Design a protein around this nucleic acid. Structure first.
Lengths: 43, 101
RNA sequence: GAAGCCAGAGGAAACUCUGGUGGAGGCUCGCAGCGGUUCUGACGUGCAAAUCGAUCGUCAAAUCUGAGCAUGGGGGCGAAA
RNA sequence: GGAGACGACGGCGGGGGCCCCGGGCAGAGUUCUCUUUUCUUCUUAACGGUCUAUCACCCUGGAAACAGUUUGUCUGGAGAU
RNA sequence: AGGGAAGUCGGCAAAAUAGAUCCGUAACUUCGGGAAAAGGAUUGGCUCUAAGGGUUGGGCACGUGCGUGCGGUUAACAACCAACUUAGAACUGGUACGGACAGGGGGAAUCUGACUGUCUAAUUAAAACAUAGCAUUGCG
RNA sequence: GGUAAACGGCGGGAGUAACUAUGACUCUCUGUAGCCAAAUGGAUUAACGAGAUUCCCACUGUCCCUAUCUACUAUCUAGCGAAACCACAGCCAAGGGAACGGGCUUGGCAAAAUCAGCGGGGAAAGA
RNA sequence: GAAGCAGAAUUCGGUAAGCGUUGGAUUGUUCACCCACUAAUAGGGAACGUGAGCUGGGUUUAGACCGUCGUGAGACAGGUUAGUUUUACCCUACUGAUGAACUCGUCGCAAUGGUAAUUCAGCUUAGUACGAGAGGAACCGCUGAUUCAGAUAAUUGGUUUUU
RNA sequence: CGAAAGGGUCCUGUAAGCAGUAGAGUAGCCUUGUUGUUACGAUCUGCUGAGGGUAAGCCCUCCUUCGCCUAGAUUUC
């Protein structure tokens, strides 16, 4: 909701576009725009 | 200008009635009932900015103070000053009364 | 709303900010013109051996266009189909 | 030596013509009611005379406490006001 | 009517949006843009109010309508003339107020060609061609 | 003899007895956000596009499930008036060896002259 | 009809085509499998033993990139994009509409052709039969609904050139 | 029977005009404000469920009017 309100992802009546922001966040997660990795197990 | 004027008389495009607005102004319990029939996360301005006379939500206090100077809000004020049509006035128009003993 | 210019506010100065002015761009919406994207479009012995309607691209320029002139088939011309 | 003799675009100023407003004479229309109303004519060529019209140039004089000045910041001891 | 893509290979077609004033406007970016992003508030009529202009015109002492010598910057005043914008307020009709006409649907992404431009007149307008930039070769 | 080293070939690194091109003969090879680089470490490139694709909100006669209205036709009349195509003709069923019947055989049947439509054959695609 | 088939729900089989057999999602793909409603969501033929209704794929003229091959013109193991066939007024068939001859008309008959209904639920039976328990029917009677069919416009919607 | 008309039944929504101590306000003349007065002025109120339409596929009317009529042509055991 905060991401939608900050980025203007609003439907009719100013309601946040939660599903569209979720799709954007997921796309950024897979396409290397958010840093994440699985650490290797310690021997 | 009215958005989608072709289907503004449909039941799914219906707005709040003037007698309901009068009861909302007179009783906070009725307004509370109407507000619990809505979700606060979907309302403009998180539901914090509401005009009872227009029965309509706004994104900000600036927008609410803005519409108060407009003619639709003054039209609503004049209609409320005249008084909404009710079943009591409908009975009084034909001379009908209720006998409860 | 680009350079150029004016004023005010700071800065030792170079410069910084604010409000104007100005009217640049193979910029943009769009009329005419030029073109020709789409439609189970019209038409299909048609008005027409390529026309009509709506919609569309472009619209100060690598824009549109007249006349005169030049290039002629083993050729010419070709932002090359 | 000059003229003939020369690009595109932008805003600014002058002039003609058109558009618009008011008064007047004449005519026409409207008129249940209103409308001292609505409409129409009211023009002046080429060719000449005469008096004037941005730029520019000339004379006096020598400008900082710089000045004049355009919508647009250009001009001035190479002489500005 | 009700539902709102359940239709269809596919939202094809239609509908919805649209002028103007004000609030506000994200990522990304070659810092120029994106952008009219997105999302909102309003618009009729009538009666008023306010602001934004132009032209002309200064007292004495002499010579006689002009020439000097002075004196003053409340003309911050009078007279006349003039047109279109902008803002504010009250009142009032309403189912409509850019009332016809005119007039962006918007957004998240992917591929692709840098862009503006050009071609298969009469089935293909495009990742095709051209373009600026870059690189190489030959020639005194 | 030298290369535009363009095409092309090219798994490395050491040695030597060859001694130069071709060598040949052994050996063995597996930071939950840093460091270093002249703020950045990029092509995951912005804008622009009648280019191709997926999805969301709004919107609706695309359907569900169709209904109704208008104009011009189609219709009927007056006038005027073609063309395509055409061996001959047009009801079917079963059989008709060459997997084809419209005419033959055997049956069903079968009654003048017509009008508006329709798209199964038969005709009809500069086929 | 048969089965440890108590009841309920079934299973195997027989006669039977009278009557039904549905939405929908998924095109990184042999589009075949999923989810639901339901009484049930059975399978085929009349094309595919070549073949003009419309419309997406096999699918393929001319334009264009990308991959493989080729010195090349070009060809393909391939992948992507854009792309011209446009009747009917003829005979027959079918659906409707007239009709000569038998004077005109009214009331009729009926050969022949067609033919139509379908499924579920609820009340009662009955918490009964049956059953250790959990559970749990049916015939007669009654009322609605699903699909289909034929009509109709009192009412409610829709449609407005009643301009 | 036809054309009008009248009545009914429906549809719309209160006609034109006149008036008003209704009307936000503005401007004049004077009693300089005491509806001071007069003028204009969206609108409002009253006359006014009034005006307008009504079969073209609405109803009634021997009894409200006007008009028309026993044809013409063709054919027939």
């Amino acid at each position: 909701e905060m991401l939608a309100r900050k980025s203007g992802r609003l439907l009719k009546g100013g309601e946040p576009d939660v599903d569209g922001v979720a799709k954007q966040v997921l796309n950024d997660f897979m396409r290397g725009k958010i840093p994440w990795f699985t650490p290797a197990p310690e021997p | 200008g009215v958005f989608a004027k072709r289907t503004m008389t449909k039941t799914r495009r219906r707005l709040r009635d003037l007698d309901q607005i009068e009861r909302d102004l007179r009783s906070p319990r009725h307004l509370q009932q109407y507000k619990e029939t809505k979700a606060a996360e979907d309302l403009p301005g998180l539901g914090l900015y509401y005009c009872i006379e227009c029965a309509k939500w706004f994104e900000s206090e600036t927008s609410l103070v803005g519409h108060r100077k407009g003619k639709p809000h003054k039209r609503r004020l004049k209609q409320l000053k005249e008084g909404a049509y009710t079943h009591e006035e409908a009975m009084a128009a034909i001379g009908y009364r209720i006998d409860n003993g």
